[PDB]
Amino acid sequence: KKKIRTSPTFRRPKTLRLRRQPKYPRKSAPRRNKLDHYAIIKFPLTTESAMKKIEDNNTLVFIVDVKANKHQIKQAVKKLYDIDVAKVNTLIRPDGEKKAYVRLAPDYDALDVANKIGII
Amino acid sequence: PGRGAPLAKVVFRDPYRFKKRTELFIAAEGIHTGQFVYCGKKAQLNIGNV
Amino acid sequence: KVVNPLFEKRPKNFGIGQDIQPKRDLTRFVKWPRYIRLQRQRAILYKRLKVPPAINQFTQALDRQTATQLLKLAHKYRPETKQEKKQRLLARAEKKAAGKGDVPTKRPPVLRAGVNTVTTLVENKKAQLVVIAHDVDPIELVVFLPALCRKMGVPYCIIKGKARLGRLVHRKTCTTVAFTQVNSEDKGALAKLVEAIRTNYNDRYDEIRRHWGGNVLGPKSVARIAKLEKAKAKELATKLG
Amino acid sequence: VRPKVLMRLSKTKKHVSRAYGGSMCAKCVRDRIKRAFLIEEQKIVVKVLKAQAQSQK
């Protein structure tokens, strides 16, 4: 005396959908991150324009992996050079390489950071 | 566009749910905006009634 | 007496053009799924068309009381399940190991099931009673069974639901079951069942053969035709006398 | 303003302190108030009229 159809449309009833509980992982182990920080930062750029950026804009110029975005570049530089960075500008060179202008924090000096990297 | 008859946009009340139903009647000559038109078996003979 | 004067009736009238209609039961006017429409239209077709007597005879099933007595009798002769068959086999193994031996011990009478088994029993005149479900969907497995049972002389009845026979035989579905020889204490109940069933099915086989089914119009058509008939009968009544 | 600028305007800049304010003009709000009142009065009148008319068989 309570089952009533107030709409002339029959909709498909809602049934529960179980979450997958596989009996074996399809891959034995996760594939490791190939794009770690050493892979992200390939080598610094040491041209005259890069040296001008170092001595003027407090900016280090790197050649990075093409698949690395600004967040990844920032974290990679922060980890493997122990410096705080203000911002990252990214372009892709006509030869296909990706170039990152990393502007450091004001309390970090690009000149002696480049010295301890070895690109003075 | 494409036809010579004007079209009448008429708004009705939905009899079963709270909503306004808009139709696109073909304008019988003499009807005007702001006019009530009546549709059904018990409607009276007036220009625009259905 | 203490009722708040602010309370009042606020009745809404559901005439045409007035307050919008309440959410009422629309089950008659629902756009149903295609499978529901198909099964309902099949049910309607089985009443529209002329059902031949060989198919229509299965609409005559046992009444609920007679079916209750029949199933209550048949519950004493259900086939043994897998677990109790294991128990009996283990008991026989223990007994033969120590120390009685073969010991058939009078393999008890049991209800035989399956259309092929029942057909063979009927052809051999070994079955004492045949019970046929009324709703075998591929209806060719059992259409010959009433005629075959009547010719061989074994009493047969038609019962509502193959699911009940399946529950008798610990399965989902059984077309037919057969009563072969029975225990002495149940011989009297089986005799009464056979008497009633033979009165209802085997004795009136001649007009079971001729009772066609279906050929019934819809309620709207019947009402319209009766309306025409009354429309002319009301004036023929004044015409006469 | 453009429609997406209205998302950063305050509430007061997008309406007028009146019923239907910022959606309907004042003249037609007055017309609707009068129309509603007078049509409900007319319904009362016709109800009273049929009530006094049905007093005879």
Add this chain to the structure above:
RNA sequence: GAAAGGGAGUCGGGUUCAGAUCCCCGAAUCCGGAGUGGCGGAGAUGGGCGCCGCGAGGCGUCCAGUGCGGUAACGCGACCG
């Protein structure tokens, strides 16, 4: 399915051999976020009755309080849903 349609919000100055509304300097602005609520402001903090108190003002109780102005167009910084 539009680098010409719809589509929030960046401008001024300087700078290179070659880049800039993108870099530097300086002024802004849009969108999203803030669970532990960042600070203010608004809501919202008034009347009545008994008392105390020279008056002002304090105490207790009871009752309000989802803002306000203009005849109006409409306005005010918010203004539950």
Add this chain to the structure above:
RNA sequence: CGAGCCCCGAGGGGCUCUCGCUUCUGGCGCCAAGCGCCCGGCCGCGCGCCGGCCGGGCGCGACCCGCUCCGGGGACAGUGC
């Protein structure tokens, strides 16, 4: 409500349109009022249908039954050879 069809005792069934609530206005209209029956908790007459206060459910409101959603064709059209 109705013309009252017809019995009329002025009751009233068989008997017809009605087995209807919307036409002077460029408003509004949903998420049920009301009634009835119950199920909890609170304090509590502290005798039970029993004092009242905070919640929840069902039914009537919104008639019953039914076998094609409603209507128009139709053994024709159409399709295959």
